[PDB]
Write a protein that binds this ligand. Sequence first.
Ligand SMILES: [Mg+2]
Ligand SMILES: [Mg+2]
Ligand SMILES: [Mg+2]
Ligand SMILES: [Mg+2]
Ligand SMILES: [Mg+2]
Ligand SMILES: [Mg+2]
Ligand SMILES: [Mg+2]
Ligand SMILES: [Mg+2]
Ligand SMILES: [Mg+2]
Ligand SMILES: [Mg+2]
Ligand SMILES: [Mg+2]
Ligand SMILES: [Mg+2]
Ligand SMILES: [Mg+2]
Ligand SMILES: [Mg+2]
Ligand SMILES: [Mg+2]
Ligand SMILES: [Mg+2]
Ligand SMILES: [Mg+2]
Ligand SMILES: [Mg+2]
Ligand SMILES: [Mg+2]
Ligand SMILES: [Mg+2]
Ligand SMILES: [Mg+2]
Ligand SMILES: [Mg+2]
Ligand SMILES: [Mg+2]
Ligand SMILES: [Mg+2]
Ligand SMILES: [Mg+2]
Ligand SMILES: [Mg+2]
Lengths: 380, 132, 62
Amino acid sequence: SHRKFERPRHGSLGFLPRKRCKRLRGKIRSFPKDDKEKPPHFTAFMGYKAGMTHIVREVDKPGSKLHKKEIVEACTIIECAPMVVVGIVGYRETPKGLRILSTVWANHVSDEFRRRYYKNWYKSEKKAFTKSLNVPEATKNCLLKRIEKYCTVLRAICHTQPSKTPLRMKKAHIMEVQINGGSMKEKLEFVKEMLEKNLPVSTVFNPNEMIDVISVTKGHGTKGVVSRYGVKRLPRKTHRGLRKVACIGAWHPARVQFQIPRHGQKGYFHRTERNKKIYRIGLKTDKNSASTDADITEKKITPMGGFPHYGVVNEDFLLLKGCVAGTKKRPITLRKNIVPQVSRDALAQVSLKFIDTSSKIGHGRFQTSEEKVKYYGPLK
Amino acid sequence: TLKNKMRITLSLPVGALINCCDNSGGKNLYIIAVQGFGSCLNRLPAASLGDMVLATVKKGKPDLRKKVLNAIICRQSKAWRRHEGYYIYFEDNAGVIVNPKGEMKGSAITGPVARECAELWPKLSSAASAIV
Amino acid sequence: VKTEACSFSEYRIYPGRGQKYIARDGKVYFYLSSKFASLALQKKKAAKLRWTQTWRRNNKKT
RNA sequence: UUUGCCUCAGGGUGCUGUAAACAUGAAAGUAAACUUUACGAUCUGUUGAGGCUUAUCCCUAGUGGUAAAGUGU
RNA sequence: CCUUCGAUGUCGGCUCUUCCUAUCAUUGGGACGCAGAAGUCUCAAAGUGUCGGAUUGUUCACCCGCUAAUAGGGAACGUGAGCUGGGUUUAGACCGUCGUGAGACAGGUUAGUUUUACCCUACUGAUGAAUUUUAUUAUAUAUAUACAUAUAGUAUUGUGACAGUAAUCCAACUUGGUACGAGAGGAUUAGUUGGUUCAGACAAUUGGUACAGCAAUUGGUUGACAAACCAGUGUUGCGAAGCUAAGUCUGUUGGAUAAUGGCUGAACGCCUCUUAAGCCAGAAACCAUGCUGAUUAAACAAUACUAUCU
RNA sequence: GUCAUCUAAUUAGUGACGCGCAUGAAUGGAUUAACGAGAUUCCCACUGUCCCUACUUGCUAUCUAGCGAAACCACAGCCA
RNA sequence: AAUGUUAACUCAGAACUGAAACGGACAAGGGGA
RNA sequence: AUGAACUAGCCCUGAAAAUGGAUGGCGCUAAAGCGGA
RNA sequence: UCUGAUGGAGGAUCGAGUUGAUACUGACGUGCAAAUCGUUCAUUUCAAUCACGUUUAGGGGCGAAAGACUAAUCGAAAAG
Ligand SMILES: [Mg+2]
Ligand SMILES: [Mg+2]
Ligand SMILES: [Mg+2]
Ligand SMILES: [Mg+2]
Ligand SMILES: [Mg+2]
Ligand SMILES: [Mg+2]
Ligand SMILES: [Mg+2]
Ligand SMILES: [Mg+2]
Ligand SMILES: [Mg+2]
Ligand SMILES: [Mg+2]
Ligand SMILES: [Mg+2]
Ligand SMILES: [Mg+2]
Ligand SMILES: [Mg+2]
Ligand SMILES: [Mg+2]
Ligand SMILES: [Mg+2]
Ligand SMILES: [Mg+2]
Ligand SMILES: [Mg+2]
Ligand SMILES: [Mg+2]
Ligand SMILES: [Mg+2]
Ligand SMILES: [Mg+2]
Ligand SMILES: [Mg+2]
Ligand SMILES: [Mg+2]
Ligand SMILES: [Mg+2]
Ligand SMILES: [Mg+2]
Ligand SMILES: [Mg+2]
Ligand SMILES: [Mg+2]
């Protein structure tokens, strides 16, 4: 018989296999379509989630009951130590998908980067890359030429500098970053210019840019059906237990169906959240980084007592509107949007009035320790 | 006459009994339905500050009892996020009886009223003392 | 920065922080924190709490 | 897995709410000396004190540590 | 009365999924006794949705109210090793009628044990070897070469076949008291700001949570003070962090079509959307894009290093 | 069943009505204070019963060392 | 009649006192129509 | 050499049900269809 | 005939224990258990409870009646 009262299904079937992601470093599934009219630019960037603060922002939306008024908004902070470019990879389009021609490496590859090619650095003789680094430039040139000739898509092998962050791990995070621009030649030139050097975020993103944020979600291990899918608790009266699904399925398809919610992994899923606005791009060389026209007080972005479970952001950082998947310390990949958005949301220019820097470890009263000291006075 | 209303924390579900707030002669209001509420399997319809309810008067003038009657919520105790970042709450849940159009059946409004409600119902602003 | 004041304590409430309780009358009380709000609810009198500024002033502890 | 890491400690950040100790300090009063001496919830001073603060907080080249030596190809 | 009487657990609700379309709403149309608005009939459509209660064991029913709409169905009259057990269908008991009576009632009323998964599969997640009659969309200095390449082991980065798929509806306002209309009334469409439902995260903030912790305190116990303890977490207060919703954030645009309207244009010297050939625009559908997985491909590529290799 | 009343709505409840399929007088009729782990309805208080779930504690589960059953079982074990 | 030695435990009243709390744990009717 | 009326072949409509789906399958249209020889 | 004491009646009231077994139709249901566990509940000066002794025996007993009980056996025990 038909179900008496109709309701929408509980999970999204669009996010199935609710299994653990293969790696902490969210992979970019796809990069923006190529618009060969525009200059060559990177499309992506890796950063580490540091925490959230709140912000105060004056609004522009003519017609809203929230028009001229200051508003408070949550924002993530993503520490964004300059990514370093190490390689170029050339793809060519086939009826079987993208196939790599080659990868061309820098002459000098960081120790950090090398650490990725080992699971026991401490023991190893660290021979990785020691012969490639040597190679003659002629070969490289030839490779480049080949790429120019045949490859339709260029990616840059970039890696993070986690040494310049409070994170424990000396291993780099290595990531391919598609380059989108005019002529393949032009792209190649751009990558050559870049190669061994550093990309800071300002070279990739701008204020008020709408960005997609791709990251592995916070883990919760094996979770019940109730938590994992938002299935209804059965009543108190229930014998075998309340927190389950009463009927898996009908009798006749005599097989539990993949559409029925079940106990199992929740979190540590890969996820692309879209349309996250950059409210601010911080700079390492700015003591007035969390300061504003309305503030006018020396503030670094780090809250008092430091980002809980992270540490102290001492480098360029992104202030993204709202929330981002995963935990404090998680790698996040920021990606340019795959469509050039013209919606008033994407065009709006933000002007922060205030950025909270009160302790996140408690209900903080003060912005700076100095203020606190002033408040209290001299004491024991 | 804008019904633009920024979302406010939902909690005053069907069955709730709220103070009548008004000069109408009604002492209480038992909320039986929320207007503009849609469909959600086992979810109780639940009203907030701006919302139009349909109520009965449990206690009050007999000419108000035994009838379903439109009301507006003026106060609630569920704290709700004002967009300047602070959460406001009143001590009491309280609304004012009105017509479908939104015209008060009563004349004055006893206690304070939320600004969220003032912005929505001009005739209610009129009869409000402290509007906060 | 327009810092409101904590009513129960005399603390500065920077934007987007505390909560606002509008009593029976129309009088608003702004509390910086959960604790303060709880205290207010309990009808506790700040001038009888050793840590608060109101108490401090009463005992001339500047 | 020695420009790390653990470990304590210090500093930060908070949380709590003012520690023990002493005070010919105060105290509703009482009693028993020839104005002093007992008892006395509690309060006040020294006291935003004391305690706690990563076990899944933060910083510090601040302390002492960093073994096993085995297996697979 | 074919199957099942060496038992297929016999109503309904709760939960949960999927399917159908004989479409209630939403998308796009066609007709009208279509002026507008509202509605009626109807085509492509099953993408999205279809609620809260009162009474009843109910299915069904009937009202109240919201709603865009409160369409109809199936899946062993879905779903009892999922529950529930109100009903029906044991034993107690009561009434009514019937029976001389024991008793009967497809009459009414009350009280009445709901067992087992540790097996195989399925599904959910979780590891994980092996894979040369196997592979390959090219490699190599304009020529060659499948009469050819390919050791293996670690690791990184990719490929992405295939599978899954996600957003939905409304309101208010401006367009407009305009078009339309004798007047009453009164739009479509875009545009803006919001909200619903759903999904996916997240915890700055508010709230929740306590066997981090601090403080209080009852009864007892250590001579007292202190420091503690005990009362299965003694009980309060606050309570960071971590979890978390009732809190915050985010949720596309192409291709090719369907209905349909058209174009050129015969058959049929004219006409004809094609009921020929040839074309066009065109849907919440379809397929991509995007999104999740990809020991779903026993898949594969490149790169890094190596133990012997030719 | 009809009419009230309880409700926004009540196949429930209560009060009436009665040619009562088939009520009725020790098959006892009608009514009754007190009493009831009795049946039923409504109202106040109260609450996680619910909206709408969350967090948390022991003991299990879990992994290890030790110990170690059974029902069941033609053969077995993917679908249209 | 005044002056002695001396005993329970119970009642009643008043000050002060505290983060308004106190049958602080334990124990212990939900009530009405 | 157009206009009628019929007529019966194949085809089309009429032709809507629930797991996904069955001329047995793939597929077939100068048939691998239907009727003959 | 009122008022205050006294007095201490009652198959009176509440209630540990005891005797039971209302609800959770909780746990358990290959149990600790062929009826247990938990919390809640009813019973407590009388038609009360318990022990031992004693009587009543199968178409018989015993029954404040449930076809209850009569050694896990009862609409006719068990043994042969
Ligand atoms: Mg915090
Ligand atoms: Mg329901
Ligand atoms: Mg809190
Ligand atoms: Mg002291
Ligand atoms: Mg640590
Ligand atoms: Mg079966
Ligand atoms: Mg149809
Ligand atoms: Mg229709
Ligand atoms: Mg049927
Ligand atoms: Mg079953
Ligand atoms: Mg069962
Ligand atoms: Mg059933
Ligand atoms: Mg029953
Ligand atoms: Mg019976
Ligand atoms: Mg918290
Ligand atoms: Mg002891
Ligand atoms: Mg609390
Ligand atoms: Mg023709
Ligand atoms: Mg009722
Ligand atoms: Mg009656
Ligand atoms: Mg008779
Ligand atoms: Mg054939
Ligand atoms: Mg019983
Ligand atoms: Mg049971
Ligand atoms: Mg069990
Ligand atoms: Mg027996």
